[PDB]
Amino acid sequence: MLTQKTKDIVKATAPVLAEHGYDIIKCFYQRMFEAHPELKNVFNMAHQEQGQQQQALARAVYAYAENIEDPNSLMAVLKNIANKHASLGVKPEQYPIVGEHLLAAIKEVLGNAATDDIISAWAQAYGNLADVLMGMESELYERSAEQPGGWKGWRTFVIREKRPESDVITSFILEPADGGPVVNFEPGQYTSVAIDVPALGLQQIRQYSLSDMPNGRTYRISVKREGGGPQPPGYVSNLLHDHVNVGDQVKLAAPYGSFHIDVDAKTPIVLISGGVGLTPMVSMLKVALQAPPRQVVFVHGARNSAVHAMRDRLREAAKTYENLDLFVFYDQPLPEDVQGRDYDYPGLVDVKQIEKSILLPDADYYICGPIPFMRMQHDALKNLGIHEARIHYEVFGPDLFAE
Numbered sequence: 001m002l003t004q005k006t007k008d009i010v011k012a013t014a015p016v017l018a019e020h021g022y023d024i025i026k027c028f029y030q031r032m033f034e035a036h037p038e039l040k041n042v043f044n045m046a047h048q049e050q051g052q053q054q055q056a057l058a059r060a061v062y063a064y065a066e067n068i069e070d071p072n073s074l075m076a077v078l079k080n081i082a083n084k085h086a087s088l089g090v091k092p093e094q095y096p097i098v099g100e101h102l103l104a105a106i107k108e109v110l111g112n113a114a115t116d117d118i119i120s121a122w123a124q125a126y127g128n129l130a131d132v133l134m135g136m137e138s139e140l141y142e143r144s145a146e147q148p149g150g151w152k153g154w155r156t157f158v159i160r161e162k163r164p165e166s167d168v169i170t171s172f173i174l175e176p177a178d179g180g181p182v183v184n185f186e187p188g189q190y191t192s193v194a195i196d197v198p199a200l201g202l203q204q205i206r207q208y209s210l211s212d213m214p215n216g217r218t219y220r221i222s223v224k225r226e227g228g229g230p231q232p233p234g235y236v237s238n239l240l241h242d243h244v245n246v247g248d249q250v251k252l253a254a255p256y257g258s259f260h261i262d263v264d265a266k267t268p269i270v271l272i273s274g275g276v277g278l279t280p281m282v283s284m285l286k287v288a289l290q291a292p293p294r295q296v297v298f299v300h301g302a303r304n305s306a307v308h309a310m311r312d313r314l315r316e317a318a319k320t321y322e323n324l325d326l327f328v329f330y331d332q333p334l335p336e337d338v339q340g341r342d343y344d345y346p347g348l349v350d351v352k353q354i355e356k357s358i359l360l361p362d363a364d365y366y367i368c369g370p371i372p373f374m375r376m377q378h379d380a381l382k383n384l385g386i387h388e389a390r391i392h393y394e395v396f397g398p399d400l401f402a403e
C-alpha cells in the first residue's frame with residue numbers, strides 16, 4: 001500500500017513518464033519478447049502509428065496520477081482493464097514478468113531522470129495495481145466459471161454461417177463444438193477470438209462485440225475488413241473474411257466488459273453515440289427501453305442526412321416510449337438539412353448545450369463511437385462534475401463511422 005510520500009513522487013513524475021511513454025513501451029516489448037517470446041501470442045504484434053500510441057499511453061499515465069488519491073474512482077477505471085485482461089486470459093503468474101521488463105525499460109529510457117526514489121516509487125505503484133487487478137480478474141474468472149454455460153480460458157466454437165453484410169462487413173454465427181449451452185451476455189459486452197496467423201506464425205487475439213441478444217446456444221459477431229493500401233491490412237479481420245469459413249473452428253473467451261446497462265437499477269440512463277449505427281446499438285436500445293419506466297436520454301451525433309437510418313429508428317422509438325428524449329447533432333449538415341427539423345444542433349456532440357437535459361441526478365452515461373470522440377465526451381462530463389464510476393464507454397461494434 002502506498003504512503004503519501006510515494007504517491008507524491010508518482011504525481012510529480014507522471015508528466016515525465018508520459019513524455020517518454022512510447023519509447024518506454026517500445027523498449028519494454030523488445031526486452032520482454034526476447035526473454036519470453038511466448039507472450040507474443042497474447043500481445044498485438046501489429047505495429048501502430050507512433051503518434052497515436054504516445055497519445056494513448058500519455059492519457060493512461062495521467063489517468064493514474066489523477067485518481068491515485070481517490071480509490072473509488074481508481075477502482076472504476078481499473079474495472080475496465082480487469083475485464084479486458086479476463087477476455088485476453090491474463091494470468092497472475094505473468095505480472096512479475098511484465099513488472100521486471102517494464103521497470104528496466106523505464107530506467108533505461110529515462111536515463112539520468114530515473115533516480116532511485118523514482119524507480120522505487122513506480123515499482124510500488126506497479127505492485128499495488130497488480131495486486132488489485134489480479135483480485136478483480138480472479139473474481140471475473142470465478143463468476144464466469146460458475147455461470148450456466150460459462151467457462152474459463154478458451155472454448156472451441158464452429159462457424160455455422162458466414163453472412164456478408166456489405167463490401168467490408170461480414171457476420172459470423174458461432175456454435176460451441178461440444179454442442180452445450182453458452183453463457184448469457186449483456187449488450188455492449190464482447191468476446192475475444194484467439195486464432196493462429198500464418199503470416200506471423202503466432203496466435204493473435206482480437207475483441208468483437210457480441211451481436212443481438214443471448215439465446216443460450218449461439219453467438220454472432222460482425223467483422224469489418226481492416227486496412228489496405230496506405231495502411232497495411234489488418235491481420236485478423238482479413239484472415240476471418242478470406243480464410244475462416246463455415247465448418248472451421250476458432251477459440252472464444254467467455255463474455256466480458258463493463259460497458260452495458262444495469263437492467264436491475266432504476267436510475268436515469270444517458271446514451272451518447274457519435275457515429276455508431278444500428279449495430280449492435282438497437283440491442284442496447286432495447287434494454288434501455290425495457291420495463292418499467294426509466295428516464296432515458298439519447299444523444300445522436302451524426303454528420304448529416306446522407307445516412308439517416310439510426311436517426312429514424314430513434315424518432316420511431318421516441319414516438320412510442322414516453323420517458324425518452326432524443327437530441328441530434330450534425331457536424332456538417334447538408335444544404336437541404338435545416339435545424340429544428342432534420343436535427344437539433346450543428347457540430348459534434350456538445351453536452352454544454354443540453355446540460356439541463358443530461359444533468360440528471362444519479363444518472364449513468366454510456367458513450368460509444370470513435371475513440372477520440374469517447375475521450376472527448378468522457379472529459380466533458382468530468383468537467384460537469386460527473387464521477388468516473390458513472391461514466392461508461394467502450395469500442396462497440398464493426399463501424400464507429402456508420403452515420
Ligand SMILES: Cc1cc2nc3c(=O)[nH]c(=O)nc-3n(C[C@H](O)[C@H](O)[C@H](O)COP(=O)(O)OP(=O)(O)OC[C@H]3O[C@@H](n4cnc5c(N)ncnc54)[C@H](O)[C@@H]3O)c2cc1C
Pocket residue numbers: 044046047048049190206207208209210221222223224225226227228231232233234235236237238394395396397398399
Ligand atoms: C471491446 C472491443 C470490441 C470490438 N468490436 C469490434 C466489432 O464488433 N467488429 C469489428 O470489426 N471490430 C471490433 N473491434 C476491433 C477488433 O478487435 C480488431 O481491432 C479489428 O478487427 C482490427 O484487427 P486486425 O487484426 O484486423 O488488425 P491489426 O493487424 O491489429 O491492425 C490494426 C490497424 O493498424 C493498421 N496498421 C497495421 N500495420 C501498421 C503499421 N506498421 N503502421 C501503421 N498502421 C498499421 C491496420 O491496417 C489496422 O487498421 C473491437 C475492439 C474492442 C477493443
Ligand code: HEM
Pocket residue numbers: 039042043044060080081084085088090091094095096098126127129130133
Ligand atoms: C499492474 C499491471 C498492469 C497494468 C496497469 C495494465 C494496464 C493495461 C492497460 C491500461 C491496458 C489497455 C486497456 C484498454 O485498452 O482498455 C492494457 C492492455 C493489455 N494488457 Fe494489461 N496491464 C497490466 C498488466 C498486464 C499483464 C501482466 C499482462 C499479461 C501478459 C498484460 C497484457 C495486456 C494486453 C495483451 C493488453 C492488450 C493490448 C495489446 O495487445 O498490446 N497486462 N493493460
Ligand code: NA
Pocket residue numbers: 096097098099100101
Ligand atoms: Na521477472
